[model samples]
Target: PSGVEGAAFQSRLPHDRMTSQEAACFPDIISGPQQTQKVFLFIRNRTLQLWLDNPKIQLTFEATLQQLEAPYNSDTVLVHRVHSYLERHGLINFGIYKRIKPLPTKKTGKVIIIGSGVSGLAAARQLQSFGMDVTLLEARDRVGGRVATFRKGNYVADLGAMVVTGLGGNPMAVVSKQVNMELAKIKQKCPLYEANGQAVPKEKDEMVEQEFNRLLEATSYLSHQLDFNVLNNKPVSLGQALEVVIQLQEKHVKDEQIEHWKKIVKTQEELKELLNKMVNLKEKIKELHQQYKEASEVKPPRDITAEFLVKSKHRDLTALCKEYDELAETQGKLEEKLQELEANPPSDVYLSSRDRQILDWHFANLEFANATPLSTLSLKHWDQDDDFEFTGSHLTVRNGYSCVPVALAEGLDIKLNTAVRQVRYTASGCEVIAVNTRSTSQTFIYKCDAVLCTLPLGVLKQQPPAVQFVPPLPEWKTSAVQRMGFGNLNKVVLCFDRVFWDPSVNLFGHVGSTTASRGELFLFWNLYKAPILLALVAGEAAGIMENISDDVIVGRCLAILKGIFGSSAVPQPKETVVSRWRADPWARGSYSYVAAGSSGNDYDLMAQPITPGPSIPGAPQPIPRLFFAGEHTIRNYPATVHGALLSGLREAGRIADQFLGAMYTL
Candidate 1:
């Protein structure tokens, strides 16, 4: 829908509140005139023509999802961004969250969950509510595991996870209801900075070198001269308009789904004709056989044998055979293409050389969004949390994400500065032995009915000497933990003496900062127009920063700032702090990222308990007594606060169902 007609459909969708400036961010993705010219230009490009005909299917299935899904590069470009945007304006949690009924447990038993992160806290809360004695333990002095937040000079920032990503289903909303916290959407406005440190405007401008290439790809289809527009006196011709109408009409011939069903129809006709010709030839062969049989002594009439009779009588079986082969070929092509239309993935989309480059850069920068490099990232299912598919703008939790642990851990017996030395689990009960992290002078032992391990995947992957597991965990469980990547995402937050950039700007990225073909200095949130600039860098550069000292990381950030500000006259950070998730042994790294060859199945495997024996029908299945929770444990919502909480609740619910009475469920 174009600008005006588009809003007519708005009433059907729920109203989401947004400021005047905020509303401006999500304008119509179809900005320019109707893109119709390209439809005529590419007569052979069936997919491109089909897309030009229908925006609904176009946006959903097109080559390189960028232009179709995010026709405009604004915040409304990606589904995640759009959803986040909807959330920022009071949209994520529009509906009521119904609490589930608690399940019955066989017995109320003591449960010791190691870790004070959001996941652990969630599990503890459910278990405690179900009438089990729950104990929360942490190696670090802090409660939140990766959700740590602190002050550096003037900036109040998160040391680990900041954004409450999964909008509606996010546990942060429950936390919000528990203890109200303001979440702000950081709609980015910083001008792009070229490698020469020149600030590029957001508007489209025809320039030289890389700049020209960018505009060519953005406006025209991949630098080709196929720019289509609907404006009067524009480049689009009547022929283009006719072709688009025709192509769009093409799909509706049989079904909107089977765009080219005509091919299948034609193939069937051809096969029918060929089969009829073969049937006539067979009758002729039998007639020929009778003629030969009556020729001489003991002549056999109309022989049943077919191959020789047909070959001899037809005198040209090879040609008929070739025609039959052609029939098979046509059927194969029709079936294959038809299958794609049936199962329905994007059949094709036009991508120029420059478009490919744009995609290469685009996918690489996704690491900054997820904190994991693209090579090992599961591109297929990384952001597959369908529940949070709608909207929630980027927001800051003023009290820090750690507030989750604070509220959830409250009224619970939480032990800080206690490192779990060993976890020995048996079928009946679990033994958790610990020591003061500072000194091994004293040992603490807990004989508990169950132990919930909510530790990060990296820590769990570590050698037993650090946190030993007696009678090492099942190989399958360990394998899943190993295959899953625990990436390091670094933050070099700076507090300057004053605001160095424009107030209208909320975020910025280093345009050509491809030191290792990795986008660094991806995000910078200008908080309350203060000098507190939060810089987030990811991928290889973040890993490299992990090895460097805090000052070095700060200096690198300053250099980038100075370049953008145009000179050294830009003020240096009065205070600086770099988040070292890689250095922090407790966290090991940031959240878990699905590796290239892996899927949610690995996460499901990680949550499986080490059971004692095979199950018996109608028998009370023994609760593993060894529970698991964390971001990695939740298959549907990994690397998200909501996912972690969901996972914790899942584990706790399982325990409650078996150990305590089924009164309520997480």
Candidate 2:
């Protein structure tokens, strides 16, 4: 229905609380240019009456209603019931007068958004819902940003973000629910193997696994202690802190060795005393047995007297035997302790050879999670958002991650293939200059009360800016943009003809031979609804992978497979997908991270909206002319899909709050 044709009528018969009366009723009507009666309904004396401006169309619907299985008479039917029948048949556009009132509002003001990623789409969607005129502009032909999907004839893969972390309380998880997308929880069994394809022994795996776990726990504990006025000096990198903890552990091991030797020496002396006592008690027991035998051999008449004396002596013998048994038991326990201590002596170093290899693999995984190297990662705020993790199983979208963006983009005003060039703002409003990337290459300007910039941090960090600010960004904003770390993490997805590896295991580890090569294909994810394997490269290796050719990268992956499973068992992959996020112009890197020198305050500063003009006493707060939001803007939830979504909602609410109690009048 067109806007004006659907809203043409208003009744003055007190429809809000109308009562049937005996007087002649004449309803008041407001007609539009079309002069079309969209719906005509009344309840007089508790009987419904129906009509339409076109008699022929009304008769046609009336005839169809008569042929129904369950007859619907207008008089016997409710006003809503008759309207529904005609409305279903397309005789009217609106069923009730309540819908005829206007829904769109103009007081919320126009907003121009310069990105259509999850954050942009969410912000635009919220503002549009507030009855504001919102226009979303995108540089790329498609949306979803890093949550991209790649599809061939039958094969589908998530090119960017695949797994959904923090399912229950995560906003992305809830977005899937609204879009009717299914999520599958992946299995948790991940086996570890050495460079030589040898499965790590269970005992060795558990030993090193707990060792690595304790190291992490130690870092958390130490970080908390340092935060509690323990260290007011410069914040060190996580790599440096780990090395310090390892050295402390080595010192503790030596101290424990000294205590262990002292116990062994003390136990040896006690065991010698116990052996001497046991021997003495054995001799006494033998003597008591001989006395009992002599007593029994006495004549029957004198046996009673002998038995009484023997019984008295037997009690003393039994007591001595009990004392000897206790000493013998203590000696056996001390011997076991001595054997145990001598058999497996404590290692001088905290990190063993196997432990180093496993720890390297774990650090590689951390790089993949943060998209930043250990040397650059912050020690104090690395896990600042750990407590805010959503509680539930992590999931992967059934079709693709794009389903989420597609749903969020629905009903939103989006201009694809539009790249923003510059943004100019004043105290009252802002103007955004963009160019058409598809055909015209023509420049366009959008003036609005507010402008929300959702550009990636990497783009913001560029020297020759992607989107220039008219007066340039403030010093505090520019400082954070430079200090915040952005790093790359690439994926090499190999599509095999058939499944070759263990099907039950969903994930597996490949330990590197050295520290430098630790992040080279360290993780292999089995995406096995089909026979596909996703090999992840993080840290410095990920940066190097961007320059290498796809075929060479695939060859390196095959070589790793050959080392694990023999060359014959592992076949050449039919198709391959290599992600070069660093090479992508729109996204220079994968995600955001806290650099060694940077703190969480950088994120809060990045999110702060720029409000022009000075404060006035007893005056209302000014609305922000320029706003910022993205994964990089949120402190506790950076580098996540939910973080991006929440950042958008937060800015939307901020703008809405400014418009509160301000509405347009006719």
Candidate 3:
């Protein structure tokens, strides 16, 4: 009875490891729409009464399909529920789904997973462990999208993806080993400042801490020369290599002027260890301003006293006397920027316009740390998100980064406030529609066979409020969502009912000032035992801190926290928050980079697969089940969260090996 006619069971399967010639080009096995053929006839009569006619092969296939419609050929139905969940774990995870080609029938398929984040709830908990009922929509009422979190009471932070960046080949260490989330105080101590908030000197000729470690070893050698011109596609930028080191600093300072830069600073060992750490920090800032210029006339018994300035307070001694006259006018502009980096050409140098504006303020502080900019970052696909090498121990999950998407959304059916909009694929299935995101007249729809969107490549490259695809998505997947880049990375937080600064530091940044303030809040975290301060920013300063106001980003992060703990030891912050994530029209930013002359292969063209129709050779065709997991379809851990939980476990292992055929597991 289970022979289901019409083009002979459209890619029939009743076991024999998924055959209808690869279920007629897989097409995510049963595509979608027709109300998922009533859950593929209740998952092929409950997999022929639990594995091979348990008692009577689905009551003699309902006495041969009530003798009227016996097109009951069953199969595909997701890798025999992934080979019966690997014989209940006894068959020791058989090379994932027992070497595919599963031969059973009763093709049950339906997937939708669009943006609930952490790669759409880890691709709906890995396709609802094989026998999927997966629907999940989430337009956010909850469910970690930007990995957000913010609590008020006993105070908590993380307004999106707070750490979990590196640690043992991190696939976010499987939601940090499922919620026990630890590891903080991983030796972070950070401290530099300046964009008017002083404290930039750290002794020993610390001219802006030797230009913040020579702008992090010159942007890791211009991001390894844009990862060697993007593997020879020859891409480049750091704003045209800081305008070719500022016009080769007036042609290598009038053709090697200063004694050919003090004889190549003694054989250029990295410009003689950054000219010996800025000449041992400007000779200890002229030997502590030669005992403060011989007690500048023994000022009022070592100045500062109104009751010791109200109890040992006073903006770190008026920002340490405006950083000893700004390190004696920045040690005469770092001795004229160490003779214009000793007259250039030791493999390109000569910078000094205050070292090319603090190396474009440290390359827009790490291209908005994936919140984009630095002329469309992506040198070797920027901070390569990959092969679970998240890189360091920047941990933290203890409480909220939405507890690993609320522990991978436990009994996940997840709808939240819906808001999917329109998906509509055809040549077999897929539908959607959604809404509700606060009752937009409630709408619904659904139908599936495969969808896995996980949105955000900056809202599928903007041009589609939320989801709009009825007959759209394809111009090579909207030019791989307009050549993938999505970014924003903005945050400001603050709470302070005390615990004003340095409660044993965590991080802070500023170094050297000049005001084109792009991405203004250069770092600042400080939480540990929690008095909270936060403050980060990125890409056009997170789009100008989403057009300013939270009382001017808490009076511009408390005037850069009173030029770093002074202006009478800064205070004013009882609570603030900020983070507009590119003015979230359902989050259009924060996460996903890799741009300059592309190399994100458009995150494999937004995780290709969306045939919509055309392509046969076998029997059941019209394929492209519309897929795409997040972190811009993952190109080596895209903008992190173990590259959006390994691009939602690699789009639920590419829909369990293309539409539930399965050669995938765990």
Candidate 4:
């Protein structure tokens, strides 16, 4: 099996480089069960063989070789197969390849990228690398969009995204590597304090924590097991699901206690009957003794048989008296237990005060995480992206998060203080009208071949239309934007002159007095570098804080701190910075969430591009002039910084393919 006839099937024959052609052929062979024979397929004199001994290895080897055969069959179909093949092998560069036929001029094509967020920057950078003339227009004077960092001297805090949700396999992680950014893991040290300023007992903390976590686990199970149609023929909100979970949990405890109560009642009755029988036995023994005494006392000369009968009756009577005494002791102990049960019946309330408070804390945190209330979040699809979550502990940027966005816009053409007014596109070309923020009256028109809009979903949802379209967005896209939820989680950074709270604690929680105020100031993160305590306002509370003045918010924050620490020990903050993302015209809100009536499919619908022109004889399929990219557009990793970056890269690949006339690439 080593000669020329058998040599074609060996495993180690330089099968490293992957060609495009072999990539196209691998799918047909690797799926089914392997045959015993040495299967050889010839493509352009290249031999791709699958051996019997190492069938899987041989198949992979063939796939690798096929990845390099792009030029042989360079059709869109072939490009598509190869693109997918390369992605499967972790070589995702289907869009970076040089075009087979260069454009009329490398700098002739003008592409406008609106919004200088991470997504827009990623798209512009990639498209520029492909020799397309790229121009980025941003409304703010600076880049980074929601990734803004507030840097004033040593006090550095990210106003937008601070934590990298996960690092492993995250696109933002890869970007950080490119930028050589430093990351630090957040220490897991959270202390909880009661509203009365007393530190929560660790024992109570653990009990409530376990109770809350178990409730969530039970909710997860119920979320999966329940059928919407069986309940009310409609999907429920996460808030509703949590209530059902709580109710079911309460029922289980109640049932267990009720069963215990029933057992106690039955045992009490049995003990009472046993005591009555013992009393009856005692009376019978006494009567027998009396009869024996009478027999013995009789003067009449009795026979020896009668005397023997009196003695046997006395013995039996004595044994019966001893048995009655033992039975009386057992009845006494059972009655004692019955009395305790009667005094302390099963409690009517299954959920304790501590349980409800901890659960409220958990729900408030959930609202912060989702940037929306549980009532608005979809129960069925709320955590669907958890399956695709990156594997690793969340990391905080040692440097400001703004470094990432700034680094991305390094060599790109970005215009600051330019806000887009409207986009006019008609299949062939497009025009973007923007007004300079510095001089509002001065408007400029940017005519381009294609337009990629990376505006936030909040911006798109504006009633007055933040950015108007010539023919208006399609019905489906508009409805999808309307259906999806964009929520806010405002931040209040309080920098004290000296740390009043414990320096060892990195995070802490505050229990609100009522359910309505649970999300008012629930979470606190301690930035150790400076004596800064960053408080987060989530759920409906975030929106309420927007209309309130900064002085009032600062006063409220100090009040909370004074409540946590003694008023004598707590000091006024030296400086404070509060974020109002809800009131910001450009941002409108923080991020997007899957609302009650919406599903993940809405993300896909939002990502769908608007094809402006009708089909013509010259071009069978009209090119999509309008493209979209944002965290809201991606399904697997929505509301994440990496998701926005990936969406940008995704649209970049699509735009690249269209420019090169390779529709199936990337």
- Deviation of model 4 at 436, angstroms: 3.7
After superposing candidate 4 on the true structure, give the runs of residues whose Cα lies further than 4 Å from its correct spot: 1-106, 180-182, 228-230, 275-349, 438-440, 615-621, 663-666
Over 1-666, each residue of candidate 4 has an lDDT whose tens digit, in order, gives 333233222321223332343434454444433430113222211322222222222223234355535444344343345444333222232112223334335374789999999889888877775568999999999998999988887777888998897764565544554575668777777887767767778887778778777777766776777554125666678888788888876888889788878979798788978978987897898799888888778555678888787778888888997898899788888878888887876667766776588668878888999998888888778887887766668877767789888887877899999999999988678999999999999999999988999999999999888889987998999999999999898999888778788777768998877778788888888754778888989987899888999999888888878888878887887778999998887789999999988989999998988888553656655678999998999998899888888888878767876675542222
**Candidates 2 and 3 compared by TM-score, better number:** 2
Pairs clashing within candidate 2: none
lDDT accuracy of residue 103 in candidate 3: 33
Off by over 4 Å in 2: 1-108, 226-233, 254-344, 438-441, 613-622, 660-666
The per-residue C-alpha lDDT of model 3 at residue 486 equals 73
lDDT of 1 by residue, 1-666 (tens): 323222212211212232242234433422323342221111112222222223222122223224422233232224333432332222222111222334346536899999988888877876665568889879989888877777544356777777765343244544565455667776745455655566554342112224333422343341134434433653332223333533443444435435455555665666577667657666655665565454432334635564455445455444545665675676576556656644653334333333333333443356675677655555344544544442455677765667666766766789999889889886567899989988879899999888999988889977654688876788898889887878778887777786668766777655544435445665577754356678876777777776777777777677777777766556766777777787788878888877754667898899987764324555555657677889988776778776677677767767765675432110
After TM-score superposition, the amount by which residue 607's alpha carbon in candidate 4 deviates from its true location, in angstroms, is: 1.5
Query: TM-score: which candidate is best?
Result: 4
Question: Residue 62 of model 4: what lDDT?
Answer: 33
Every candidate's lDDT? 0.60, 0.72, 0.61, 0.75
**What range of 10 consecutive residues in model 2 has the weakest lDDT sum?**
3-12
lDDT of 3 by residue, 541-591 (tens): 677667767897788678877867778767777777888877887777777
